[PDB]
């Protein structure tokens, strides 16, 4: 589960609430399963939104 174009994957980190508790948390990626012609043909794979805007064609 990562963007095929760039190395964008699910990262991890803490979740500091009031009193600075240290509950563990995960950070996802805003990626969608849209059609892109990464190869000679379209494949409908995951791709990051940040990379989708003004980037590779759909």
């Amino acid at each position: 589960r990562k963007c095929v174009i760039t190395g964008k994957k699910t990262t991890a980190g803490n979740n500091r609430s009031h009193a600075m508790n240290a509950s563990k948390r995960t950070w996802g990626a805003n990626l969608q399963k849209v059609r892109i012609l990464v190869n000679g043909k379209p494949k409908k794979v995951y791709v990051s939104a940040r990379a989708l805007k003004s980037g590779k064609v759909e």
Partner: protein, 149 residues
């Protein structure tokens, strides 16, 4: 993102109506329908080239046409047609007769619609025939008719 429209958005925009078109919807619709094309350096340069080419073509087409057309139109042309007593002409030389005259005499090759004459000359004299050489420029043709035999 910016696009080079190929057809109407709110009216035919083949001239490249550069705009901002909601990149998502822009891509989806314009690409699925071919309504436009990406506004990159290559496509922009191609559009500019095609546009300047057609502009110069039209400019030349109008320039070459107006000049000699008017210059020659400033000449005198004459023909002959029988007439009766009392000046009652036996016929009338319409635009078709004048077109045939200019085609067989001077070889001007002007369309019968571009050169029109509704009054239907019935007089045995001289007359100036305006012409729609250009939507903004026009010239007259000094036509003449005289008795025959």
């Amino acid at each position: 993102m910016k696009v080079i429209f190929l057809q109407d958005v709110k009216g035919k925009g083949k001239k490249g109506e550069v705009k901002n078109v909601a990149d998502g919807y822009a891509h989806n619709f314009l690409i699925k329908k071919g309504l436009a094309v990406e506004a990159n350096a290559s496509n922009i340069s191609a559009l500019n080239g095609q546009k300047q080419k057609e502009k110069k073509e039209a400019i030349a087409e109008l320039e070459q046409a107006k000049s000699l057309k008017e210059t020659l139109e400033k000449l005198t042309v004459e023909l002959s047609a029988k007439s009766g007593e009392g000046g009652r002409l036996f016929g009338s030389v319409t635009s078709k007769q004048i077109t045939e005259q200019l085609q067989k005499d001077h070889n001007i090759k002007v369309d019968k619609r571009k050169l029109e004459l509704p009054d239907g000359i019935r007089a045995l004299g001289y007359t100036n025939v305006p012409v729609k050489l250009h939507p903004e420029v026009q010239a007259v043709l000094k036509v003449h008719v005289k008795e025959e035999a």
